[PDB]
RNA sequence: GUUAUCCGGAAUGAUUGGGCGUAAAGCGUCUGUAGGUGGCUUUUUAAGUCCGCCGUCAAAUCCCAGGGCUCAACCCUGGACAGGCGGUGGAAACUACCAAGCUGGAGUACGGUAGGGGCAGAGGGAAUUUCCGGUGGAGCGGUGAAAUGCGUAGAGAUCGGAAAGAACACCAACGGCGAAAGCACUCUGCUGGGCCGACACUGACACUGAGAGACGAAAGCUAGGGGAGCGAAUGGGAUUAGAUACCCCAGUAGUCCUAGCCGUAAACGAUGGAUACUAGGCGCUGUGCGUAUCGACCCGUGCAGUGUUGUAGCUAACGCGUUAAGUAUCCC
């Protein structure tokens, strides 16, 4: 999914040397997602490079039986800060462009999110990845703390 | 010798070093470096007197009557 | 040292971020209790006491590095809530729970210090010392 | 649909929820009054805090559950979470209070030791300028190139004499002290701090600071001195289209001293203060310990400050990085 297409410029003695930068995320909508960034002379080629760079950068988002987040989380990348919190089933995904495409492509069905701090697409994507990467699923906190699930449930 | 850490001895040592410094402040008035110190030390003595007034009223009034220290600015 | 609690918490956070298992903290009823609780929750490996020149030091072993020092998925977070400038209190029904309960909340109440879980069983509110992830 | 009004989005006045090295933003620097926060241990009390019960916070509205107008809007019944205030019964961890304790915080005494710290009083030499002589006898001085200027009324040069003021070469160093400003030829006197080693002692006396106070480069001003050099202003010579500038020749205020006033600076680390806690490497200054010898090193180390690279972490990037711009608390 192509998030953003921009025309960046290098300048040479001749004139303006034009390129396209594409920010693109890939997902299966099944709980596997990644971000990637690419650069080329043509829209198509940059799209493609972005595709590959993403595929080799990819990770997995912890999910809950209802297709949502384990818990509430913040994240920080550059000047982009990102706020995610779990939702009740049937609320859909409500968020802004970068965060929303990332989460939607991960396959998260119900999520609250707001990017605070900056607006830049790319950074917000990476921040979202940082968020959902640090998410701890309950089985694993049970295993870490060394305490049975039902005891933390209460 | 008595208590060299006691409230009343410390306040005495301060009061005395102050009245000793007053003479040098008079002969040379253009030494500010010294006066800055005098203000510091006088500040310490004032502090201990206030503390001592909080803790014990009798010892305090006895002391500032004894060493001829001016009555406090809380009135 | 205007606040001792925040200080303990802080030393822990610092030793933790630096990937060191061992911490020296200064002991106190609050300190000791807090650490006890920290152990029965399973956030910290082991604790013990030392004494020199009438000073008490609790040394704390900390949970080992996660499958290397470099690739860490998890850190261990601590946050002061009620602090000398603003004291935060809560009744029974406002008692906080951290990340759906995965973490814990420390309460100082009438019956002593405890977790939010204990407060919920016994039905007491009180002063919230800190949050622990 | 357009216009107007209000909240939103706006984290764009921020408790939840921001910042202040360079983006707007740290008072120039201290001393300190109110004010706010404040180490550990035991007891007390129960003001906060917490739990139970009661009174009330009118009905209508909002929320939940039914009922009625064909439905809905609307109407009707019943009930309640919040949250506020008041009475009463309990709980005693934290803040607060009351009583006694404790040193690691802050001080006092003792003994050391470095220092351009400050004020005051003595003394010293180069160099320069002018004046008085002797020699000597045409140019000196100056610029990119010149000219004004000084010179046969004997300049410059050189030797000898006096007199005066101001500044202190080498040492000097990516060194010392100071709150900052600043402080350096030498000496002596009066005095401020700082640090270190010992339990010798008090036993929280702490940290910050609205107002308020003191200090505060240079220029400037009032009054009296002083006046060599330098030199705003001013004048002449050039340069230039012009030159009220750069360059040169002269040179008044001022620069100095005494007694005041002014209170500002890129007063800069462009970084408020206190505390606690988080790899190192290479350095320096002051001290202490052990070792080396029995006195200078030397080594290893403990502190206190000071400088340079750099891990974690932070940051928009540059970079900062135990002297944080890191992780936390308090005050301005
Ligand atoms: Mg390439
Ligand atoms: Mg940030
Ligand atoms: Mg926004
Ligand atoms: Mg309440
Ligand atoms: Mg309309
Ligand atoms: Mg707002
Ligand atoms: Mg605004
Ligand atoms: Mg801002
Ligand atoms: Mg600027
Ligand atoms: Mg600025
Ligand atoms: Mg400053
Ligand atoms: Mg400034
Ligand atoms: Mg001012
Ligand atoms: Mg102060
Ligand atoms: Mg006070
Ligand atoms: Mg108090
Ligand atoms: Mg306390
Ligand atoms: Mg009503
Ligand atoms: Mg209804
Ligand atoms: Mg009906
Ligand atoms: Mg009703
Ligand atoms: Mg009520
Ligand atoms: Mg009541
Ligand atoms: Mg008690
Ligand atoms: Mg007491
Ligand atoms: Mg003098
Ligand atoms: Mg001479
Ligand atoms: Mg002749
Ligand atoms: Mg002529
Ligand atoms: Mg003549
Ligand atoms: Mg002749
Ligand atoms: Mg001559
Ligand atoms: Mg002379
Ligand atoms: Mg210094
Ligand atoms: Mg000087
Ligand atoms: Mg001295
Ligand atoms: Mg005693
Ligand atoms: Mg002020
Ligand atoms: Mg003044
Ligand atoms: Mg002047
Ligand atoms: Mg004038
Ligand atoms: Mg004059
Ligand atoms: Mg003159
Ligand atoms: Mg001149
Ligand atoms: Mg002219
Ligand atoms: Mg004239
Ligand atoms: Mg002309
Ligand atoms: Mg002249
Ligand atoms: Mg003067
Ligand atoms: Mg200013
Ligand atoms: Mg300066
Ligand atoms: Mg050597
Ligand atoms: Mg140091
Ligand atoms: Mg540096
Ligand atoms: Mg560095
Ligand atoms: Mg910053």
């Amino acid at each position: 999914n192509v998030v953003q297409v921009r025309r960046v410029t290098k300048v040479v003695k001749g004139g303006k040397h034009m390129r396209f930068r594409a920010i693109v995320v890939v997902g299966d909508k099944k709980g596997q997602v990644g971000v990637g960034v690419g650069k080329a002379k043509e829209v198509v080629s940059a799209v493609q490079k972005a595709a590959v760079d993403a595929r080799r950068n990819i990770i997995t988002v912890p999910m809950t039986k209802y297709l949502t987040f384990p818990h509430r989380n913040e994240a920080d990348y550059g000047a982009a800060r990102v706020m995610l919190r779990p939702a009740a089933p049937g609320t859909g995904v409500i968020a802004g462009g970068a965060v929303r495409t990332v989460l939607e492509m991960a396959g998260v069905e119900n999520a609250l999110g707001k990017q605070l701090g900056s607006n830049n697409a790319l950074n917000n994507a990476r921040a979202t990845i940082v968020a959902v990467q640090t998410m701890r699923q309950f089985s694993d906190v049970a295993r870490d703390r060394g305490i049975p699930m039902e005891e933390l449930w209460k | 010798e008595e208590n060299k850490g006691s409230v009343e001895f410390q306040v005495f040592c301060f009061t005395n070093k102050i009245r000793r410094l007053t003479l040098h402040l008079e002969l040379h008035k253009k030494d500010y470096s010294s006066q800055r110190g005098l203000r510091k030390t006088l500040g310490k003595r004032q502090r201990l007197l206030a503390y001592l007034l909080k803790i014990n009223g009798v010892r305090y009034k006895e002391l500032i009557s004894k060493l001829n220290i001016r009555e406090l600015k809380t009135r | 040292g205007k606040d001792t609690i925040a200080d303990i918490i802080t030393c822990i956070r610092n030793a933790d971020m630096n990937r060191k298992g061992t911490v020296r903290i200064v002991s106190t009823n609050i300190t000791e209790n807090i650490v006890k609780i920290l152990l029965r929750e399973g956030f910290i490996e082991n604790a013990r006491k030392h004494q020199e020149r009438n000073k008490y030091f609790l040394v704390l072993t900390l949970r080992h590095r996660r499958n290397k020092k470099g690739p860490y998925l998890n850190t261990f977070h601590l946050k002061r809530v009620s602090r000398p400038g603003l004291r935060i209190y809560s009744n029974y029904q406002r008692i906080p729970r951290i990340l759906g309960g995965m973490g814990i909340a420390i309460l100082s109440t009438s019956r002593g210090i405890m977790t939010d879980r204990e407060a919920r069983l016994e039905g007491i509110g009180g002063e919230i010392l800190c949050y622990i992830w």
Side-chain angles (χ1 to χ4, degrees):
Chain A
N1 185 261
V2 41
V3 155
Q4 216 197 353
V5 173
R6 274 195 166 188
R7 343 193 38 226
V8 316
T9 301
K10 162 168 182 172
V11 168
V12 304
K13 31 175 167 176
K16 298 180 184 187
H17 176 110
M18 284 288 174
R19 294 183 183 149
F20 285 76
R21 187 187 59 178
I23 302 163
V24 165
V25 289
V26 281
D28 48 351
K29 304 256 200 178
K30 270 150 193 195
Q32 198 81 355
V33 87
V35 318
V37 39
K39 232 170 74 177
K41 182 177 176 181
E42 250 196 64
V43 40
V44 185
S45 319
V47 148
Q48 197 145 348
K49 296 194 168 184
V52 172
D53 285 339
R55 291 207 232 274
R56 81 132 153 256
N57 196 231
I58 200 166
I59 65 130
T60 296
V61 46
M63 292 256 76
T64 307
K65 168 189 180 178
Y66 300 92
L67 307 172
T68 184
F69 289 128
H71 56 274
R72 154 181 231 193
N73 197 19
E74 298 181 13
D76 284 311
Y77 201 82
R81 189 145 173 241
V82 162
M83 155 67 55
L84 313 180
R85 34 188 271 185
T91 61
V93 189
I94 55 105
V99 178
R100 161 164 211 161
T101 51
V102 156
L103 289 179
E104 184 180 0
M105 223 57 54
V108 186
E109 200 36 61
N110 318 272
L112 297 206
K114 193 174 214 300
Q115 55 200 38
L116 338 173
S118 140
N119 70 312
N120 166 37
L122 185 45
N123 285 333
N124 274 318
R126 297 233 181 84
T128 308
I129 289 304
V130 157
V132 316
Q133 187 193 332
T134 327
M135 223 78 81
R136 311 190 202 179
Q137 193 72 34
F138 256 144
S139 305
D140 298 324
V141 299
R143 174 194 188 181
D144 286 351
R145 290 235 243 141
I147 289 180
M149 177 72 59
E150 309 163 11
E151 299 189 10
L152 300 184
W153 266 351
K154 306 152 191 168
Chain B
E1 190 154 4
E2 302 294 328
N3 293 276
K4 278 173 161 198
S6 73
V7 186
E8 311 204 353
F9 180 93
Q10 279 190 69
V11 170
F12 174 78
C13 180
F14 291 167
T15 302
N16 179 72
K17 172 199 176 179
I18 285 188
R19 296 183 197 183
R20 122 157 268 171
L21 221 36
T22 294
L23 304 186
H24 173 229
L25 244 336
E26 281 168 16
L27 294 185
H28 317 152
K29 309 175 180 180
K30 199 203 148 198
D31 199 345
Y32 297 111
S33 310
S34 303
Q35 188 193 25
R36 197 180 91 87
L38 159 62
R39 201 69 204 177
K40 280 189 178 177
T41 293
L42 167 55
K44 311 177 85 163
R45 180 188 77 185
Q46 179 188 2
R47 275 178 197 187
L48 283 186
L49 280 179
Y51 154 79
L52 180 62
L53 175 63
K54 164 205 181 173
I55 297 292
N56 192 320
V58 198
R59 294 166 53 200
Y60 169 77
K61 185 194 165 185
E62 154 199 2
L63 181 75
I64 80 163
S65 186
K66 162 188 172 184
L67 300 181
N68 207 343
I69 296 181
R70 192 169 187 185
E71 310 154 349
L72 213 56
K73 342 199 172 184
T74 316
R75 277 189 147 215
Chain C
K2 289 202 179 179
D3 201 7
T4 47
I5 328 295
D7 190 274
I8 303 142
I9 291 181
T10 279
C11 299
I12 303 155
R13 197 186 307 122
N14 282 333
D16 186 289
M17 201 156 41
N18 211 347
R19 326 248 184 73
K20 317 187 165 202
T22 297
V23 202
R24 275 180 223 169
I25 317 185
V26 163
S27 102
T28 282
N29 322 303
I30 330 171
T31 312
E32 299 181 336
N33 288 287
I34 284 183
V35 174
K36 286 187 163 190
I37 314 170
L38 265 169
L39 265 169
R40 106 194 163 208
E41 307 157 46
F43 277 134
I44 142 191
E45 216 101 330
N46 168 257
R48 65 182 180 180
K49 315 174 196 172
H50 294 341
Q51 293 187 39
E52 52 184 55
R53 302 191 185 186
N54 287 336
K55 315 162 192 253
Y56 291 61
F57 291 80
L58 313 189
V59 330
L60 312 191
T61 314
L62 193 39
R63 203 158 44 181
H64 209 41
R65 53 181 185 171
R66 316 281 200 173
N67 279 321
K68 251 133 219 177
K69 278 178 185 180
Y72 67 102
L73 294 164
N74 294 335
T75 337
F76 155 80
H77 305 280
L78 288 125
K79 174 180 181 176
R80 191 66 157 122
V81 184
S82 171
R83 21 176 209 82
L86 174 50
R87 304 312 187 92
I88 281 300
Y89 307 84
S90 67
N91 56 37
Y92 169 79
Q93 307 179 11
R94 297 306 177 141
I95 288 171
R97 73 162 166 188
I98 306 309
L99 299 196
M102 150 197 158
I104 74 106
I106 295 187
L107 284 84
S108 173
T109 83
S110 323
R111 299 192 172 158
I113 319 184
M114 48 187 71
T115 77
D116 59 326
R117 187 169 169 181
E118 308 303 310
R120 291 167 171 204
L121 298 187
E122 305 176 29
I124 330 160
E127 172 160 16
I128 309 167
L129 297 183
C130 52
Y131 295 148
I132 304 182
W133 274 275

